[PDB]
Amino acid sequence: APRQVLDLEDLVFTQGSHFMANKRCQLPDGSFRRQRKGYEEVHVPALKPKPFGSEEQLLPVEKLPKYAQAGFEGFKTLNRIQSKLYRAALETDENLLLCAPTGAGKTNVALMCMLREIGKHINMDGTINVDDFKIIYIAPMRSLVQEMVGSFGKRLATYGITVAELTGDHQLCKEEISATQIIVCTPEKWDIITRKGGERTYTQLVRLIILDEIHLLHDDRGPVLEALVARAIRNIEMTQEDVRLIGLSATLPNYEDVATFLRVDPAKGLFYFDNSFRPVPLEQTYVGITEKKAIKRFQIMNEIVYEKIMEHAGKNQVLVFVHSRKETGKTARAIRDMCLEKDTLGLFLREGSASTEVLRTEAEQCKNLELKDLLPYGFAIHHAGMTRVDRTLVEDLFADKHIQVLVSTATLAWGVNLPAHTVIIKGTQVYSPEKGRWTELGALDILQMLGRAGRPQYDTKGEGILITSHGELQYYLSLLNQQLPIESQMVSKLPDMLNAEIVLGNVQNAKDAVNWLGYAYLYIRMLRSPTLYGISHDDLKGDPLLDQRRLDLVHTAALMLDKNNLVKYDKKTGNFQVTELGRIASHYYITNDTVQTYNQLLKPTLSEIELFRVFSLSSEFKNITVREEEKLELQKLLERVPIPVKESIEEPSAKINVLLQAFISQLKLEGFALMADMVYVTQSAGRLMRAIFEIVLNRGWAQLTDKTLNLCKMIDKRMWQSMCPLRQFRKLPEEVVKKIEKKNFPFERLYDLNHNEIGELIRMPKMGKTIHKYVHLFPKLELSVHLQPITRSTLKVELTITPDFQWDEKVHGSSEAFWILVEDVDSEVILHHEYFLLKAKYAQDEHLITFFVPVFEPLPPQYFIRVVSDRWLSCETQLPVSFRHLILPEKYPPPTELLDLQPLPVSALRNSAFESLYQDKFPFFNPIQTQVFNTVYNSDDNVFVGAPTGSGKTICAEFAILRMLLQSSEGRCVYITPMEALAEQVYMDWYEKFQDRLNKKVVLLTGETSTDLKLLGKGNIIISTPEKWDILSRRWKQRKNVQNINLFVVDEVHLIGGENGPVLEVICSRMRYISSQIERPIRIVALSSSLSNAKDVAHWLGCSATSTFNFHPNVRPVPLELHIQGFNISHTQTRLLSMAKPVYHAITKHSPKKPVIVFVPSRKQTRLTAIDILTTCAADIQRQRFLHCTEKDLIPYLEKLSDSTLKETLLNGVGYLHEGLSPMERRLVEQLFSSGAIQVVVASRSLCWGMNVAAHLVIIMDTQYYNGKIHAYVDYPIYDVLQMVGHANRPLQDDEGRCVIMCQGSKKDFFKKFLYEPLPVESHLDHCMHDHFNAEIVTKTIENKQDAVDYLTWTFLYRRMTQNPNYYNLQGISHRHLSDHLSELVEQTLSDLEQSKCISIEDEMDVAPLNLGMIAAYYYINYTTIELFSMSLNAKTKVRGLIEIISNAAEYENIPIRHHEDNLLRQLAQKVPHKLNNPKFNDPHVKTNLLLQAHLSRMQLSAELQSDTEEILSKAIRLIQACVD
Amino acid sequence: FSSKTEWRVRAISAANLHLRTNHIYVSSDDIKETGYTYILPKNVLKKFICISDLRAQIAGYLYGVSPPDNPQVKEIRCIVMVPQWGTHQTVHLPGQLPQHEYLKEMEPLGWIHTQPNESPQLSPQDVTTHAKIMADNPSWDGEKTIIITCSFTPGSCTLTAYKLTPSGYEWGRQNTDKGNNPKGYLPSHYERVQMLLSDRFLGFFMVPAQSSWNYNFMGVRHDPNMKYELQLANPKEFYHEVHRPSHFLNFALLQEGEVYSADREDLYA
């Protein structure tokens, strides 16, 4: 029902984890209250372990699992709780919730729960090896993270599985985090990594989520913990797959609430054990001070300290906890003043002088810090600050039984297990920079420092002193007991959590928002106690479901995210729309209030002073203020920076700016409040800068994003840009760097000297070579790039980024990251950016990125592309592009407008005897035929036709074919397409349309010489392909049966502008001159797509212009509903990870009840995509809606298969396609997708070409693909995109056809632009020359340079190179420039031909073919490959040379290499017949000789490689015969 | 220059330098119309205005050509900024010229700098600095090379343009006294050249390879003849961190300064 807005601020309980929602506490057994002078003490007796039950026996590490007995070095028998839990903890995936107090080793229970997953992955001669499973252990503290990292590394090394802290950058530590097994981290940290996308690969490889200190749900950051809990449970349920939750929580109530939250079985899965399981019986003096008086409180507390240390001054160890660093040693030496104003009475904690190691006490005297002044006496401290190994030597000193009294900080208690005979928390008051003011210290620290008052070994009956506030006193007793529920903190967090859930896709509608609440501990909390959670029993009983409370709460967060514009969520339906600002807030864990404020303030050219200003505008520290006393040094900080804070007055923002700039110049402060302030602002500066610059680069402010990136670099590397990047190599001397900068020896001219003249700069010649090491290790790159225009609005620019320095995995690591930016006239308008990374293997190696850059209607001088290291500051390199000599192409005039033609019926052609196969399919003609009939059928001249794929040029060329047949019975049409399987699609259609009806032989030739010689000229219609019609008819003059052909159809013509075009285009021009010779022209049917330069095709074909009817793709039989979906996730791993659910969304949104063609980038991956679609439409709980018919009638297609995935996928009606699948499988799959019982086909990238079965909505996913030559990905061709999209064709019934494509952020612009805009075709015969040159030279058509240039004079280059001079490499527009280019052309072609010694170049005039080129052209082989033959092969070789040479031809050099295929070929040639020397398995020739030998011995391989093998034999025999020749 | 507080009041003004650029007025006045007419792409004026400073004289060399079949228009498609140190009313640069790949097919059109303050005539320092650049480099021809001065007007950016006359070449070639009113300075040296804005084209900027353009912080790191390479990249803002080293490298802080306040929460990651 309609939503009602709320006020949710006061509905939080501030002071979380110190709230103590329980108002009354329960005393322990022997507890009482003692009254002193203004301060009270609670005397609390200690707890007793449970009474020993009969046959209740702990476990030894022997009578636990025999396998997991590894790593158990250092333990003899299992501790009571671990032995009470181990059986269930290991024997099944039953999830665990442990309830106990500190001192048991809950780490040891989680360790058994993890040995469960260990024993889940095993083998005999193979190990626990971590290529199977991953798990995660999460605790909220990074001190404990380092501790458990050191511990988990050593302990779980004995299984060989590496565990590490998940502390790396998302892309910097992803390759190395893929090699690691189960890891350790924090709740918020793991949440950040997953919401960023680092977990997108580790998920579904994850079995065990262990959570230590799980009671932290009551904490401040609890929203991350609980949101992640919800994520785990919901996605596990949404997938129907499980993940185990093994949590260990302090003894407290709400155990069953959290058990329903963890979905663990409290039946046999949970546990209960109160504080009596704590090792050392903890007797507690919880004494508070009740007065307000502050100057007197700073004495009264010291007095309680004095008396408590008088209590310990005997045989004991007193460990004091305080909330600062210098207090460790300031309360110390005050105990010195105490025992020394006691007149050395109460001092001398020993028996006497030489007693108690006074010799060691004096012998270890001089130390790092001011510890010495006390350490001569019996007082000491602890903290991380003093030195590096100082806290080590203090903790081990106390463990060596000599430190009777130590005072220290919360980190020293969080750290290593340094226990105490008695501990005392003093004051319990912390100054929170997160709260900006006084806060009762956290409860996890309470438990942590309270488990060190008394030890398992060193102390028996723990004495625990808490000197505190007599307000929070009773709460401190409820904390000494297990009285508190584990409350959730949702209310303050809600809006960012909900926005982020929608930003990743876990809430599509406010429906799914209520679904987010229905799985959270918050709604579960209120399901226990809405009376506690602000919803009365009256409303809660009138609305049981709490879906009312979910509608109230969730809707308010939605409205707030709307008000800040980080969401776009219409109130009507419940659904939402996300933005880049919201994405930055989610990805950096930022709030959308100050995020939207910054978005509103930051303008285009807002200065760097403005950037640090809107940074001080971070309302995460909205409680930042001015310190009254510290306002004196605040101005000092306002004086020492170059970029002044003067824009304001001494105030909160002034504090932000000045503290930040000081701590950025690495300033220290005397005041501790100010120190923590700077610390906090600079530590949140990470997220501030990251989100700011993220939205900036997503927007396109060029110099502004540069300035913000510089600010982020200064925040990251803790230093500014005018201070050398040299300070990023830390083993390097400050004085060295300073002398290099004194005389600024530029960062440019530093390798201009050698390590003699390098050290000549600052005259330090014992350090010059190390300096050069640092220089050459700082990643530094060069690059080269080529720009050639497509049209005045498009210029394609390919950049190879090379490194001019060397990398080391101790400096650059496993990867290098640097952003390159293509920018316009004033470095303010940003064209497009690429975030390029040098891999581990790819260091020093050229990386190629190409881009088509804008310049529509332009006469401007140039553009830039700056490539600067992301991580490294002041590390860059510029890529200019100057357009002095850049000229435009010719702009295309508008296309021939689609006239108004009344629909033509099949009664147009009066030959019903021919229309017999036409009247049956379609009643009416499409606009293309209705316009082009009067040019094609009732006309006999050549014709050029542009129309989009899916329009029907089939009937256009059929009109001409039937016309020529009616002219003469046997008169022949040579139809040729650029694709073999698509020409076979033409075969299987046209042969059945014509020969069974018209009796005329219609066939499709093949590569075989004699076969074609007998077949061709015998039939009426002959189907051919590019090489098919090149190799043959290269013998044209004596080729009689090709000479008597009536007409020629070039179908799919604009293929010329792509690869494998020059072959067909050469056939076109050659056959043209042949028709000129034949004295009877052969009508030329050019049938292709929407063409910009269709006029050039028309000129190359010689057809009339008032008959040449060219249309744009906008005139297509069915229009395209066009949708494009970007990707700002660079790595295809997380990209394809989150490409699944939005695919289903756009499917159901475009056309829910229609067929779906899911073009997937792999034959391997379409199963993955359709399966994930099934498991997510399982979330869309309506299963098998893509199945429209019954299970039992579909069975006879299931009885004829093997593959086990198709069973389920097609029984649910989605299904996928592949190459190795059965031929009858492909046929039956087309059958099911056509009949529409399985209204979906998930199809490989390679399948759309010869695909005659269309779909309803076409969606392309991952428009790139992976090739092993660059060992990387490359984007799809324009005709290929058009094909995979237009293979949605539904003209008979549907009113539209739909094309949606998910592309990368890089390719978004060119993809959107050239989807519907017109595509040209240009010259590549100038690129590939020697083929036709050698062949026609032997065939005696190319007999002189004059005839060569004459063939160049009827070519396609002749038009294209002059029409578009940027790609022609000639800057000239005239006939003299055409002369220079043509001279260069024939000269260099026959030049290389005579250079390889393949032909005869006589007197410098004549050109004739000799033996080498003769055999090459004959065998239809490469002239380069033939020179490789001639100059590798000799008389000495056996098949040992034959195999190497035969695979070393270019005839197979287009062959591919697949994902991690280099292990395959190497581990195959391991035992294959013939090996190689230092070979590559990324090598085409090594791979091809390997497959040749493999097949010659006939070993068992995969069909994926046997297809390659058969293809290799298809071009092997010809090469081998030419080799014998 | 105070370098400490006039430093930051000037920089916090320099924080706003991008509001300037979208308010322009041009010197509309008498044209002799047989001298060249210069084409300004608004982008380079965007960058010029933004990266400058509110006192320090900052300048650059112009690069561009004449179009085919109509020389009388000289379109400037390149603004180069050089190492330097400027005054508040005169900018001093190295003598030696920019030359580079994209610099091949263009000639130097002259040079363009900023001006805090206004007057409707050319500085004697302007005429003489250019006449002494032309005293050495005949690549600068008399009927080809200009000076454009960009006054920062209240709510506007104004750009006055001049070319030198041969008599101005004469007095500048002579000039020894560069004072604010040298003897023999008069109208008789300068002449205003035709300039206009045009939205048809985007050009590029230029910056030294081993430096940035702004040494105004480093008047000792500058020289009369000191040589330089070039590259294609953006100038850094006048008050950029990079040429702002000693204010940011003024570091006298110690390790023990963290030993206090030794509570070490991260609570995140």
Swiss-Prot record, chain A:
Residues 281-518, 1142-1350 form the Helicase C-terminal domain. The modification N6-acetyllysine is found at K568. Residues 1-1525 are annotated as: Interaction with C9orf78 and WBP4. The modification Phosphothreonine is found at T1025, T1362. ATP binds at residues 100-107, 947-954. One of its GO terms (molecular function) is ATP binding. It catalyses: ATP + H2O = ADP + phosphate + H(+). Widely expressed. A motif (DEVH box) lies at residues 1051-1054. GO terms for cellular component: catalytic step 2 spliceosome; cilium; membrane; nucleoplasm; nucleus; plasma membrane; spliceosomal complex; U2-type catalytic step 1 spliceosome. One of its GO terms (biological process) is mRNA splicing, via spliceosome. Residues 87-270, 934-1109 form the Helicase ATP-binding domain. The keyword Repeat applies. Belongs to the helicase family. SKI2 subfamily. Catalyzes the ATP-dependent unwinding of U4/U6 RNA duplices, an essential step in the assembly of a catalytically active spliceosome. Plays a role in pre-mRNA splicing as a core component of precatalytic, catalytic and postcatalytic spliceosomal complexes. As a component of the minor spliceosome, involved in the splicing of U12-type introns in pre-mRNAs. Involved in spliceosome assembly, activation and disassembly. Mediates changes in the dynamic network of RNA-RNA interactions in the spliceosome. Contains two helicase domains. The N-terminal helicase domain has catalytic activity by itself, contrary to the C-terminal helicase domain that may have a regulatory role and enhance the activity of the first helicase domain. Component of a core complex containing at least PRPF8, SNRNP200, EFTUD2 and SNRNP40. Component of the U5 snRNP and U4/U6-U5 tri-snRNP complexes, building blocks of the spliceosome. Component of the U4/U6-U5 tri-snRNP complex composed of the U4, U6 and U5 snRNAs and at least PRPF3, PRPF4, PRPF6, PRPF8, PRPF31, SNRNP200, TXNL4A, SNRNP40, DDX23, CD2BP2, PPIH, SNU13, EFTUD2, SART1 and USP39. Component of precatalytic, catalytic and postcatalytic spliceosomal complexes. Component of the minor spliceosome, which splices U12-type introns. This is U5 small nuclear ribonucleoprotein 200 kDa helicase. It comes from Homo sapiens. The chain holds residues 404 to 1928 of 2136 of the full protein.
UniProtKB/Swiss-Prot annotation, chain B:
Widely expressed. Residues 235-269 are annotated as: Required for interaction with EFTUD2 and SNRNP200. It comes from the Eukaryota. It is found in: Nucleus; Nucleus speckle. Residues 37-168 form the MPN domain. Changing H243P: In RP13; no effect on interaction with SNRNP200 and EFTUD2. Plays a role in pre-mRNA splicing as core component of precatalytic, catalytic and postcatalytic spliceosomal complexes, both of the predominant U2-type spliceosome and the minor U12-type spliceosome. Functions as a scaffold that mediates the ordered assembly of spliceosomal proteins and snRNAs. Required for the assembly of the U4/U6-U5 tri-snRNP complex, a building block of the spliceosome. Functions as a scaffold that positions spliceosomal U2, U5 and U6 snRNAs at splice sites on pre-mRNA substrates, so that splicing can occur. Interacts with both the 5' and the 3' splice site. The MPN (JAB/Mov34) domain mediates interaction with TSSC4 and SNRNP200. Has structural similarity with deubiquitinating enzymes, but lacks the residues that would bind the catalytic metal ion. Part of the U5 snRNP complex. Component of the U4/U6-U5 tri-snRNP complex composed of the U4, U6 and U5 snRNAs and at least PRPF3, PRPF4, PRPF6, PRPF8, PRPF31, SNRNP200, TXNL4A, SNRNP40, DDX23, CD2BP2, PPIH, SNU13, EFTUD2, SART1 and USP39. Component of the U5.U4atac/U6atac snRNP complexes in U12-dependent spliceosomes. Within the minor spliceosome, which acts on U12-type introns, interacts with PPIL2 and RBM48. Core component of U2-type precatalytic, catalytic and postcatalytic spliceosomal complexes. Found in a mRNA splicing-dependent exon junction complex (EJC) with SRRM1. It is linked to Retinitis pigmentosa 13: A retinal dystrophy belonging to the group of pigmentary retinopathies. Retinitis pigmentosa is characterized by retinal pigment deposits visible on fundus examination and primary loss of rod photoreceptor cells followed by secondary loss of cone photoreceptors. Patients typically have night vision blindness and loss of midperipheral visual field. As their condition progresses, they lose their far peripheral visual field and eventually central vision as well. This is Pre-mRNA-processing-splicing factor 8. It comes from Homo sapiens. The gene is PRPF8.
